[PDB]
Amino acid sequence: SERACMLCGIVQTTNEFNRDGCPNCQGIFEEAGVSTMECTSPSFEGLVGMCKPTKSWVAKWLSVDHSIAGMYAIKVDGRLPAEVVELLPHYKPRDGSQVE
Amino acid sequence: PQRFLLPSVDTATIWGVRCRPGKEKELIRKLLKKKFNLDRAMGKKKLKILSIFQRDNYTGRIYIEAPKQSVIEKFCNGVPDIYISQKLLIPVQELPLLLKPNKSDDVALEEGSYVRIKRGIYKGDLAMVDQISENNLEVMLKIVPQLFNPTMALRLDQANLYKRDDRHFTYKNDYIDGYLYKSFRIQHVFEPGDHVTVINGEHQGDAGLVLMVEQGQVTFMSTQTSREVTITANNLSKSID
Amino acid sequence: ENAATLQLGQEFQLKQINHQGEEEELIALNLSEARLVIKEALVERRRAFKRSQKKTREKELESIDVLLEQTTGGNNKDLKNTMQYLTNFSRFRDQETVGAVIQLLKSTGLHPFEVAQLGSLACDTADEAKTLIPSLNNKISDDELERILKELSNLETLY
Amino acid sequence: VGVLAAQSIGEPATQMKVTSGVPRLKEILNVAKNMKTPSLTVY
Amino acid sequence: RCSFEETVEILFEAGASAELDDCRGVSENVILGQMAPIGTGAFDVMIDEESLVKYM
Amino acid sequence: TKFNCLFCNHEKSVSCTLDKKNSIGTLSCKICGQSFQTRINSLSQPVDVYSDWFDAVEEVNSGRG
Amino acid sequence: LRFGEMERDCMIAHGAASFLKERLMEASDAFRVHICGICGLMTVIAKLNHNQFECKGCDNKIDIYQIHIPYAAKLLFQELMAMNITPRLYTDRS
Amino acid sequence: QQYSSAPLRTVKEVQFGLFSPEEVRAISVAKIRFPETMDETQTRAKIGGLNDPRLGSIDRNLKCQTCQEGMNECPGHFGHIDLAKPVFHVGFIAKIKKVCECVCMHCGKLLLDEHNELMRQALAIKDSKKRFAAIWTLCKTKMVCETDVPSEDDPTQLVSRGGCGNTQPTIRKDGLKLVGSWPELRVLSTEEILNIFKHISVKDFTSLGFNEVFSRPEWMILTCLPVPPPPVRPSISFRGEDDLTFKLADILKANISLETLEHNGAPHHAIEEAESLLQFHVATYMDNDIAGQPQALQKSGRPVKSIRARLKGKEGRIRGNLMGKRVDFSARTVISGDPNLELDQVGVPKSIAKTLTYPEVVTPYNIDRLTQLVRNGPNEHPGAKYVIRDSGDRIDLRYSKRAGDIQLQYGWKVERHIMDNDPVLFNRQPSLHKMSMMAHRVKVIPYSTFRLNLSVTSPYNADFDGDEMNLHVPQSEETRAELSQL
Amino acid sequence: MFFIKDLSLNITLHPSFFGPRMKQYLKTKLLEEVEGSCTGKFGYILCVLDYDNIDIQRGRILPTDGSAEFNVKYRAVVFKPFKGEVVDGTVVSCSQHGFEVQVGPMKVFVTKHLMPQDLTFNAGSNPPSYQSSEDVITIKSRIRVKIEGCISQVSSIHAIGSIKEDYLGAI
Amino acid sequence: LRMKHGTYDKLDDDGLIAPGVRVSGEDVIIGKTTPISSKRDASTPLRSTENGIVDQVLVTTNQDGLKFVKVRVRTTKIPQIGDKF
DNA sequence: CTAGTACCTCTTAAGCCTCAATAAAGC
DNA sequence: GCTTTATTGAGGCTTAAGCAGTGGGTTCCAGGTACTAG
Ligand SMILES: [Mg+2]
Ligand SMILES: [Zn+2]
Ligand SMILES: [Zn+2]
Ligand SMILES: [Zn+2]
Ligand SMILES: [Zn+2]
């Protein structure tokens, strides 16, 4: 099964998350004192293969410009843990709630 | 922040390429792997492909962000199930809506609301939303199992039957008040004398002649019953005699 | 839409077609003339039935009722009600009176409906007549209207 | 009259140098802008 | 003309032009299943109310 | 008179005119304004002019003139 | 058996209009359809048990006429209606 | 076959005007929005969808809600589809292109007016087709609308025609959607064309040949597709919905998807693809065979059958069920020579005579003979098989054991076996000429082969080498008299 | 409204009834049809005159059926109310919402809101009646009212009227 | 609920007519019933225009093992006037 | 574990557009 | 005197048409694939 992170949208197999976790948000999850699984969801829509996040406008639109190249999800369902939200004052959910 | 993310010609350039429906995700993965292999092999000379993506609701097409068409044509050359010839330039004004997440058809879940289960052994059975997880990934649904009968369960499968409260029973791993509570994924869930007719309400299909109108309520004498009935104006339709 | 402003329907035109295809002017009749023609039709029906079979508000009503029962009686109860309505509050009882009334109305040359209403409906003042038929306002002179009204009132039968 | 004429003209065709027979009848019935074997007679 | 080789094109042309058919042709009556004005059907047969009485 | 261009990477923006009387093929783009001229024969076609222009551009880029 | 077109024209030549009418309307598919006198469309609501005739398209109460036509004729008319083509069946000559 | 109070009278004329969307909505009793042809459990038809009870009765034992009738008396009813995006009509695509070329793309006004002598000459043509062709030729000759036109009497002086001045693009015909060139080529929006057609004045399309009362240029652009009732799409038992039902379901699904996309954000990129798919589906439904375009393939291994195909040629309704249709009362079998038969007398097998019947009405003249025939029964050749009462109900004799106790009454009809001296039309399938179908007097014989006079072989072109001929029995006194006399 | 006009009626007759007396049967059927007829198109048919002068056109024989269709044209007087006309009738029944007035073959209803302020319903008399400062209304009374609306039924005609202008009401 | 005019008396307990049985018209040759969810008849009626004495009947298993039946009916045809030589 | 269930797959006749000359009007 | 016109027509490509009727025998109930209920 493939799960997409609710913070950066990176899509990876559950085994990778269990073994190494999110390569781009491991530090934030560790600081928040929450597991990777709780910060990832299995439901996502659309697939994006980002090759040059720094030079790609899509990455800026998805707020993954500083992330690494790989597979990301345009839309991810679910909510991050309250601890993660408190540590991210400018966090924007990827579920489309704030796309009015 | 989003006000500064408006696409521009000199900053955003995405081309659409037709593809066989049902292979969008596989094609995207294959293209990403090919791009990684080319970057690893060629070295300094790398094709100018910024991103490759697709939309589930828009089947049979993929989108590639590159500065020049020739780069996309070279990158996609020899890839099965992709029609490089059938390609069009995405206008800048259409770029936002392309990446705008689709409005999910699932109405905002609320406690006590009635929904229909899409996946599960209770397909086509009405359910009531009792509680929603803080992560908005699982929802508790109350459903009719016929109502659970503790007597029959005790008579038949007492081994797997447990009593937690006067009205709480556990059977085959939670029944309350004869209903089953189970966790399911969200993705898995006028003027007087006018002839009028009732289109909605308890008296649907009734026809009559209006006599009085006041405060949006129309009273009409019905031929079928020969009695005056008062109904909301919005639920009545003027029928030509 | 049909109203009193001469906006008749697609069929109530000022001209009518005849069985031979000739075009004639629409002709109306008053209550007395209607009763006369109905009585003539009943007499004709009675004569036809007889030949086929061969090989003061108290007495006239009974005769009319028995005549209706004898011919075209029992088919519908509405005919008796209409006959009673016509007879109870009729105005002219003599053929000569209705003949004179129609002859006088002919000279006016107005619309058949207007003359029929004038001969049937009763009016006593110019304002009442004008408000009764606002459409027929600038069509008949006040003096002519008064003269015809008083003539009709005088011609009324004393029962 | 029309149907009788049609039947009388069609029956010989079914029964059946210069083109003749069914091809000639088909050419005559059609506009026949191009002639397979055009001919002219002068006296 | 519909009964000929061109069937639907003629129907589209008539629809565009709102052509009116008098149903005097053989094909029209055949399609409508009515006695065409052909031979026996060309004329009509009526009843004389004056000759019948004397013939009795 | 429609062909692709390499300077602006725009398709169908190229037009080729073949003067057989003067035996000259002229290729012009309606977007970037690039103009090229070459010698042509009676049997020449716009594809030939496009190929000649592409070869000339490659030679100029390589610097082996 | 099939009543061929050639047989049809042979009978037409014979002049037996009555025979053709019977063959194509009695010995073959026979249908009775209701059409309004203003819109001339077969889409007429006719409850024979209730003896109620009314067409929703045109606000008419009693202007309906019954016509005996082959089922193929009404099938063709409905197919043309699907093509936005309306054969307006009228019982009078304009 | 039920009594009706409506007056009986044959059709005398048939107007062929277009079907307006407003008329579609007014007459469409029901609305179709569910692609599924049946509800859950495959027991009840989907409400407000395909095979809805309002349109008609899907299967026997159920009476149509609209008419409370079964299958015998159920013409059917149509449904109205929203079709938010207008769709070009495949049949009128050429007409749409001609009308667009004949009128301005902005003002929706005829390019030429009566000022031009050529336009006046073209309008003088009484025939609608030739006049429209001349107008189209003159319009395509022109390339730009002029606000002011020179005056014929004073060429120097000009009269304001009321136009704008916008150039008329050279409209092409490529694929379902036409492309116009001004040069830059662009696809003309269907909404713009519909608006232009709406802006056309009465005089314009009246001159073009469109009758305002029964037709309009806008009506050509279909904004609503009528749903054929169940009779037009019978369910074949194997329910087994026909290919037309599948095409309608596909069209409805496409419309639903387009509406959902519009209501859930319209990028305008995939909207064009959805609109093109809807247009293709509609065109295939109305005409599956489209020249120079792919043919829609049914889910099964066969091209989808469309109404245009169903009305194409011999297999179509026009030439397959109207010009020539199957017959009930008729027999076919081999013919053998018989010198001992009269010229007008044709031998008939006893079995064929028993199977074939004539509905003779009961009369005092032959009451005894009809009673004797009824007593004989269907098994015996000089008898009958069905008896028709005054009410019209038919009672069979073989299934009824009390046939001998039935007393015939005047006004009834009995299906008696064809007897001797009974006119019947004998024909050979190759009806080359008029004399290939002639009336003969039936002569019952105890053999399974038709027998006819030697001479009549020549008009029939028969040779008794296996020729099979057909015998048609008249079913009315009128038909018998016409056959005997004509 | 009391208009004389020519009406054409199509009558189907079985071929059996083609005796000398078939005209009598046709006339009887015509009488049974025209009398009591009430159609919105032609209004309500009142009477048919000139019975002895009725002319019947030659009957039409169906192409296959033996029935004869005769188109008989006859002059008849008919009644049809129009909006804005003023007619007089007799009260037939009383009700809280108003009193129905029989006029000719039709019924008229008066809206309560369009009644004189002085006029008021009263149930103290048997049957209930209406009392006015200067008028009296009962079941047996001739009342002249203006007709403002007309409703067409399958076999009936209804009128909606009011009494607001002067000289209206009991006379 | 689905019963045809074919006479089922000729059928034996097994449901197949044995050789030497007179069959004509719509008489059922093979008696098969398909369960419906109680069952609907699916017999193979004899040809209406052909009749004769059943010659042989055989029962076997198809490639998938399903029961399969084949019934051959033999008739004697004598020359008649309408026969072609 | 195992098996439902749906889902994506040869000879012409006219119309029209596209071609190469040609006499008049602009200028 | 030179330049630009509406006209003329001439062929390529295209979309259409393709005896009538009748009898019978064979084959389709479509392939794999993912997702999910018992
Ligand atoms: Mg032979
Ligand atoms: Zn360029
Ligand atoms: Zn209607
Ligand atoms: Zn129905
Ligand atoms: Zn304009």
Residue numbers in the entry:
A (entry chain Y): 1 to 100
B (entry chain Z): 1 to 145, 176 to 203, 205 to 220, 584 to 635
C (entry chain D): 22 to 76, 118 to 221
D (entry chain A): 1064 to 1079, 1093 to 1119
E (entry chain A): 1399 to 1454
F (entry chain M): 21 to 85
G (entry chain B): 1128 to 1221
H (entry chain A): 4 to 185, 197 to 252, 257 to 504
Verbatim from the authors:
Cryo-electron microscopy structures of two pretermination intermediates show that Sen1 binds to Pol II and uses its adenosine triphosphatase activity to pull on exiting RNA in the 5′ direction. This is predicted to push Pol II forward, induce an unstable hypertranslocated state and destabilize the transcription bubble, thereby facilitating termination. Sen1 belongs to the ancient SF1b superfamily of helicases.
To elucidate the molecular mechanism of Sen1-dependent Pol II termination, we prepared a functional yeast Pol II pretermination complex (pre-TC). The pre-TC was assembled on a DNA–RNA template with a 35-nt-long RNA. We obtained a three-dimensional (3D) reconstruction of the pre-TC at a nominal resolution of 2.8 Å from 95,644 particles. The overall structure of the pre-TC shows a canonical elongation complex (EC) with a 9-bp DNA–RNA hybrid and the Pol II active site in the post-translocated state. The structure also shows that Sen1 binds to the pre-TC but does not interact with Spt4, Spt5 and Elf1. Instead, Sen1 directly binds the Pol II subunit Rpb3 that is located near the RNA exit site. In particular, Sen1 uses its β-barrel module to contact Domain2 of Rpb3. This interaction involves hydrogen bonds between the main-chain atoms of the β6-strand of Rpb3 and the β1-strand of the Sen1 β-barrel module, in addition to hydrophobic, polar and ionic interactions. The structure of the pre-TC also shows that Sen1 binds the RNA transcript, burying up to 13 nt (register −35 to −23 relative to the Pol II active site) within its substrate-binding channel.
